Design a protein around this ligand. Structure first.
Ligand SMILES: CC(=O)NCc1ccc2[nH]ncc2c1
Length: 338
């Protein structure tokens, strides 16, 4: 039984020569030589079985990623676990090894306009597929966008994903939310559960802005401070957009704020391509009903050199206590067993 950083990393004889990568949500991450395909691979250890939430998220991701097949979405290549429920304490998910991710790249590398364009294209191409399956990722951020040595990009981490449910999207003001703060659309803090596709487009807009400067655009330090970062750049919502927020606590909060003017994108991003800023503006639209959709974003002039809807595939179809969820993780991973 191989050990890494003083813990069992029990990946069998198939996978050998482990090197520590980093530290996931529910366990450790390593590379390993795959003795069957003769390539190094990434493997993450997942120990979710005590907690119903870690079980829920583990199972959501497994079910989604096994059903999806797309060049810009990470696959599951193998899953390692014990032969019986009783002996299964952990699950190992094997995926393609990727050199880096966008978070690491942004902290260390200047991106050319050509790189930004290509990364954005790949993100949206992957997102077209996800949305075509009626699924929302709900936690798009640089550290969930993996890149290889030739800058192929794959979206990962579907633990917070949901089926879209726009008829149940409304909630009150200051309703708590789980997904990463800096990439949360303004409506999350006002009146949205994050059950519509527009939530993901906002996050992509934040990612685009961060590619342009290497700095997150709206780095809020706490729940409501996130909204006030957004409003500091977008400025005060218009009457029409304010009138769409029927909830009085949310509406009156916005009305209580002093008038803020829009910060022009070309002053925030003086070296950016003008077509990139036109698309950014459309993704970072305050009103989620007016926000650009994924397929429109692909068709935007900024992406013209890549846009090819015949080569931007869609999914073939649309997509509980911890004891039942352990059984379900066991069943879902059975296809990888001898
Ligand atoms: C967000 C996440 O789950 N990161 C860990 C991870 C997953 C797959 C990976 N492939 N290559 C490297 C690598 C890292």
């Amino acid at each position: 039984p191989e050990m890494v950083r003083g813990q069992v990393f029990d990946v069998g004889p198939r996978y050998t020569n482990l090197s520590y990568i980093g530290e996931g949500a529910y366990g450790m991450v390593c590379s390993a030589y795959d003795n069957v395909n003769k390539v190094r691979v990434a493997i993450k250890k997942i120990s979710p079985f005590e907690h119903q939430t870690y079980c829920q998220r583990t199972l959501r991701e497994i079910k989604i990623l096994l059903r999806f097949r797309h060049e810009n979405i990470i696959g599951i290549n193998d899953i390692i676990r014990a032969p019986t429920i009783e002996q299964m304490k952990d699950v190992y998910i094997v995926q393609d090894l990727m050199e880096t991710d966008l978070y690491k790249l942004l902290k260390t590398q200047h991106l050319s306009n050509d790189h930004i364009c290509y990364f954005l294209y790949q993100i949206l191409r992957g997102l077209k597929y996800i949305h075509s399956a009626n699924v929302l990722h709900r936690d798009l951020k640089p550290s969930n966008l993996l890149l290889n040595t030739t800058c192929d990009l794959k979206i990962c981490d579907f633990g917070l994903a949901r089926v879209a449910d726009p008829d149940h999207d409304h909630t009150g003001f200051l309703t708590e939310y789980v997904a990463t703060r800096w990439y949360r659309a303004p409506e999350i803090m006002l009146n949205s559960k994050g059950y519509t596709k527009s939530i993901d487009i906002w996050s992509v807009g934040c990612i685009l802005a961060e590619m342009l400067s290497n700095r997150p655009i709206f780095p809020g330090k706490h729940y409501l401070d996130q909204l006030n970062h957004i409003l500091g750049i977008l400025g005060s919502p218009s009457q029409e957009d304010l009138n769409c927020i029927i909830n009085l606590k949310a509406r009156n909060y916005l009305l209580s704020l002093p008038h803020k003017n829009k910060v022009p994108w070309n002053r925030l991003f003086p070296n950016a391509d003008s077509k990139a800023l036109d698309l950014l503006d459309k993704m970072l639209t305050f009103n989620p009903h007016k926000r650009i959709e994924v397929e429109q974003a692909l068709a935007h002039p900024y992406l013209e050199q890549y846009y090819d809807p015949s080569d931007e595939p869609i999914a073939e179809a649309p997509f509980l206590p911890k004891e039942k969820l352990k059984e379900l993780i066991f069943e879902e991973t059975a296809r990888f067993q001898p």
